[PDB]
């Protein structure tokens, strides 16, 4: 189910994405509740000024104001939060398990699942026909996957997209997150239908839709930085053509070669989850054990 | 099944975390359907004072006072408690979820489970039995050599302990010193007289007494948890548990050839020994070469 | 699965305790959901008392009256019951769930279970691997005798738990009987809010009061039952010294005058288990006589 | 959960009727806490409307004072009485599968019956392996020593029926006498004369036309559960359920060696017969020493 | 499972019952949301007439009229539909689970399955295990012929269900047919509440009546169809003497002029199952004459 | 499943009915939420006209007018659409489940499945112990089934009946919907005779959900015609082929064995119908329809 190959450079991002969707859900709920703007007519003991206006007129006032005095973001922030969150969620997860190359990753998953528990591997690390069948599958998988370049340039594309969107989001929420102000001074000209021209407006949910904005800014900064670290690892160790050189001096069989391309990426990544399936794969990825099993079967 | 890997410390701690979550959820629920400031104009059988104010002017007054009069905490003690509770919860569950210290712990747990049902240990204290014993000894040597050098399990627990103590202290301070800024009858002096006219208003906040009591409850529970974490940190610092000593096992079973485990095995020992200080002796079975030679001979 | 060790007393108490929580929840539901104290100014054919008051001043009147006139409990009746019930539920279940006190329970239960299905027990009640298993059970019995027959870790906690529960019953009966005559359904309030509304001495009614009185009466009755059960526990835990046992009945029934009498924690364990089913006691105690072990060894030999 | 093998028809009908009573009570409470209460009006004891001139608050106070001082004993808290009574009558049907005194024998009978009806030795003998059946046979000997020893399980279904009948009779009485008095047009007289002004008021109970019907339904349902319980109590002392003997089964299987069980075996076996008259033969096979000797010979 | 065990009347009953339940659900949903009796006082350029009455006097008037002027059925056209629907549902799936009352037909079903699938039928109408298979089938056939053709526990329940169905159908049809002429959009209330509200005689319109009438006709029509199916059961149950069978075609078609004529429960079940599939009858009747057993014994020798 | 038993005519309808059910459900759901006239009294810088009418009397006016002044279909369209959709659906799904006509269809399907995938069928048309025994068993089963089925015409009429009923109901629907469709309007003018109670006589009422509901009905009517047209097309396959007489003519030339005759009546209907899903199961069935093939199977068994 691919859960084996998922570096900590790809799980904290999923968790932070869940949190972002949660903040968006709370914001959407809040904007669902409440009553929005509640504006009154300015007049440009302590008995009060009888405004004298009928209720539908006040609904006309409080509808004209909340579409001619509230800025680009302050009225529709929750929608932007949800859109960016869904974009990031789809971009990260679905990228690798795409349509173009879903087959190779799944088949490598199957081969790794088989070779993780090979009985002949257990014996040699201290069934024979099974070892031969596994060797055949390994050789075919090598000739098919190692002869490949797809599953390499999809993680680079996904991380690049994620980092680009992180930059864009920080930019957008930078500027227009200082224009969410409670008081406002609407000056519209609904003057013959209503009677009082210039009116004052005091949005209801602005305190929250500033604090939620601060929190979303923090979470987006964290996810941006983590994607930054992944983009750092992905281009500072040349993780193509991995090297089972320490494996050779580590296990004794000094003929185990170095896989390349998609095999290299799969190994270097699945190395991060648990640095032990590398040995179990390298066991079947050696030629001398093949002839040894051939002799033993005889 | 991490059951033996959970001392009394991180049992009382988790239960108190659940209680804190309950108080936070109830507080939020009460903050939802309990209205808000019900402010009214001030005048700074008896016929009532006809105040002459419309049905939206009063709403303007309420939604100006409930956001420029009532003090900081008294408006968001529910959410702040919820956030701090979530952090305190997901700050004591990383020694079992973070990659890089997890699979080794799982293997250690499985191995510790393995070396329990040993008839040879009963014999020490069926050809498969001898082969099973030898395989157990070999796997024990393998896992021990695996976890005996990089000992990040007397480190990560230390970091979690220090951070949890820090958070307890900060939370107690900030929710104690300001715990006296929630009152019933606050007086608002807001200057909006061109629209309504009345210049100084009085506001009674609805849920402003069930929150002081709730904050007292949260302070008490958090103080208990702070003391518990402090004592855990004190115990896990009273002596260097980075090296163990099964001198009792040696003096008891006559197997005096096993050395003193350290580092990762020290962590596992000194911790598991808190669950039930007898399964420790079980590992002592797969720790002597004398028994290994005896079993190898018994195979013949 | 520690269902074997649960005396008849705690057999009902836990159930009753769960029941208490139910009342708590219901009470809370009736507080937030329903309305609250209503009120009206007092002027202290037919007619109509026309008293102008815009329908916000009435809200201020209600929400000052029902916070400065209703007594200490009737506003907070549910939360107290929930809190005390959770306290009792925690107290009753920290005797089989305490680290450093539960491993003995597990070891004793495992040993007793191994003894219960013992076929060598059937043989001694009047193969080589079978005899080896019999000797293994005898050795396990010797180990358990050497380990869990010394300290009263599980003979000093049950008494403490009973003491705490009895104290809670006392304090709860006291408080919930004290004020339960101070929760009434017509209160007369006098706050000095006069410059802002006009009428300075008002009458008010707490809507959900005559029901809260009855619910609290029910809570008092159920708590008195739970206290009675705890009292019987404290009378069957202090009139017979269950920390010094003697299997004289098994000696009479089996004929072997060679099984000794366990004491202290083993005595506690045996005595408690004896209240679940009066059979496992003899099956466990049989595999402790030297004649039985000698017979098993001789059959092996 | 296997807690079905011992359940006569009486138990199934009792559970179903209990479910229906619970539903009636739930719907009633939901109604009583989701609509309008009594809605009272002031009494002045072409044309024109009789203007009353009283604000909303005063009217709400009139309603709340009247409809807590005029409506009689039952008609206000009706649904709660049905809920409590249904809870009791649902609790009585459980002190024979939870109480310690009867749980063990019940579970042992369950397991032994499950094994006994699933024995190829039954196909061997009734048509007229080795130690595993003997283990069951020894377990049967083990079972038929902890069981056939006295009257424990045949006290529960001979006492629980008594209490159920008693409480059903009582509830029939107390919902029979206090069901003539849930009226629609009631009159209240509160001395609220300085607050509102009028002295005697009239009040119609809003949802009172459904309480009479719901109470009729509850009266019929309690009648049914009472009759079923009465029948079971009559059975528990009319036909001798304290001594069974598979004598007809003795003729049907031919092996005239099966024993004559008593007390606990009597109640457990007869009620096992009630559910399906095929467990009796399916188990009685592993109860004859001749069958045991036949199995012993089969081992060789 | 029981798919072959459903007559045409059974499927028609299931369908009509589902329709009835749906109609009742729709009616209940409507009655929840919109039904409300409205009323106003009656006083015997166009200028308005000011009734002069407050906002609770109208509530008292409406909630007195809508309980003293609308008749018994009109109050709940939905309740009676729901109850009769539940009753018909209970009548459904009645004979099949009375005591356990399932093995009594499960044996017949297993017998029919084993009878259809035997090669011996093809061989007769044209190994040791097949000879053993025929022997086992014959033994089971004898056991069922003795057990099934022994009394009345498979004819009483279904017949009683049919009788109850006919009775309920006729009763509900009569009741909803006699008094459907009282649902209307105008009702004239003359209540005696005059010293309190003042306007003595009032007129009322019932909100959702001119729909309930139509729905009522709907129910009647639908119920009629179901009832007609029940009537056909009277045709099926009371005309044919299915309690006696006769292998009139078995001897003519398979050549074995010895196939017996079943009686009582077996005969009725055969006459029924003939409706579902007219092939299993010969399959079961193959093991109904001693000729088949003799042939099986000869071939297995 | 009766996969072979569904022509194109049985394909379009099975989903057009689902669409009709959706339209009806949405119409009813909307009707349940927002509706009902909002009437006002008539008079048979600008300042409004005070009316002096309470907030209950106006409700009574609304409920009397929107019950005695708006025409039948406009008042209850959605019920009508749901009912007609259910009826057409059930009529469609009758014959393939009717008592007395179902088991025969299952037997036909079983025979077809046996004959299509058969090593004997492949071998015979290409130019053992288990194979020979199975071939003999199939030959006997087919010989019995032909006389067991080709005796009457029960299941080859019900298709004619179902087609006739669907076409008739399509005619009826395209009648009623076209007729009572100009009676859905927005502004109606009601004259109730209630003057002593509310005071005004001639009232006007702007209905809501009309210039939407009416439009939906047009939609429905169009989609309804679809079903009817499809049924009419199936009528060509009904009474133009005389399908009650099958003619296995091409098989005897294209397979080489001129010993299988042409079926009639019920078998003819079943074969012609199954021939519209894949024009090859016919030959694979006719493989076990020649006497020479049975003789060869017997000889290979012998």
UniProtKB/Swiss-Prot annotation, chain A:
Q: Where in the cell is it found?
A: Cell membrane; Endoplasmic reticulum membrane
Q: What is this protein called?
A: Volume-regulated anion channel subunit LRRC8C
User: Can you tell me which family this protein belongs to?
Assistant: Belongs to the LRRC8 family.
Which cysteines form disulfides? 39-201, 65-186
Q: Which residues lie on this side of the membrane: Extracellular?
A: 178-207
Report the protein's function: Non-essential component of the volume-regulated anion channel (VRAC, also named VSOAC channel), an anion channel required to maintain a constant cell volume in response to extracellular or intracellular osmotic changes. The VRAC channel conducts iodide better than chloride and can also conduct organic osmolytes like taurine. Plays a redundant role in the efflux of amino acids, such as aspartate and glutamate, in response to osmotic stress.
- Domain comment as written in the entry: The volume-regulated anion channel (VRAC) channel forms a trimer of dimers, with symmetry mismatch between the pore-forming domain and the cytosolic LRR repeats, a topology similar to gap junction proteins.
Q: What is the effect of changing residue 283 to L?
A: In TIMES; likely pathogenic; increased volume-sensitive anion channel activity; the channel is active at isotonic conditions in which wild-type channels are normally closed
Summarize subunit and interaction data from the UniProt record for this chain: Heterohexamer; oligomerizes with other LRRC8 proteins (LRRC8A, LRRC8B, LRRC8D and/or LRRC8E) to form a heterohexamer. Homoheptamer; inactive, likely because it is not targeted to the plasma membrane in the absence of LRRC8A. In vivo, the subunit composition may depend primarily on expression levels, and heterooligomeric channels containing various proportions of the different LRRC8 proteins may coexist.
Give the species this sequence originates from. Answer: Homo sapiens (Human)
From Swiss-Prot, chain D:
State what changing residue 285 to L does.
Answer: In TIMES; likely pathogenic; increased volume-sensitive anion channel activity; the channel is active at isotonic conditions in which wild-type channels are normally closed
The regions listed as transmembrane in this protein's record are 9-33, 76-95, 158-179, 210-234
Cystine pairings recorded for this chain: 40-203, 66-188
Q: What is the effect of changing residue 30 to C?
A: Alters channel anion selectivity
Membrane-side (Extracellular) residue stretches: 180-209
Q: Where does this one sit in the cell? A: Cell membrane; Endoplasmic reticulum membrane
Expression (tissue specificity)? Expressed at highest levels in skeletal muscle, and at moderate levels in heart, lung and peripheral blood leukocytes.
The text the record gives for the protein's domains is: The volume-regulated anion channel (VRAC) channel forms a trimer of dimers, with symmetry mismatch between the pore-forming domain and the cytosolic LRR repeats, a topology similar to gap junction proteins. The cytoplasmic N-terminus preceding the first transmembrane (residues 1-22) regulates volume-regulated anion channel (VRAC) conductance, ion permeability and inactivation gating.
Q: How does it assemble?
A: Heterohexamer; oligomerizes with other LRRC8 proteins (LRRC8A, LRRC8B, LRRC8D and/or LRRC8E) to form a heterohexamer. Homoheptamer; inactive, likely because it is not targeted to the plasma membrane in the absence of LRRC8A. In vivo, the subunit composition may depend primarily on expression levels, and heterooligomeric channels containing various proportions of the different LRRC8 proteins may coexist.
Family per UniProt? Belongs to the LRRC8 family.
Recorded disease: Telangiectasia, impaired intellectual development, microcephaly, metaphyseal dysplasia, eye abnormalities, and short stature: An autosomal dominant, pleiotropic disorder characterized by variable features that include telangiectasia, gastrointestinal vascular dysplasia, intellectual disability, skeletal dysplasia with fragile bones, short stature, and eye abnormalities. Patients exhibit striking cutis marmorata in infancy.
Function description: Non-essential component of the volume-regulated anion channel (VRAC, also named VSOAC channel), an anion channel required to maintain a constant cell volume in response to extracellular or intracellular osmotic changes. The VRAC channel conducts iodide better than chloride and can also conduct organic osmolytes like taurine. Plays a redundant role in the efflux of amino acids, such as aspartate and glutamate, in response to osmotic stress.
Protein name, as recorded: Volume-regulated anion channel subunit LRRC8C
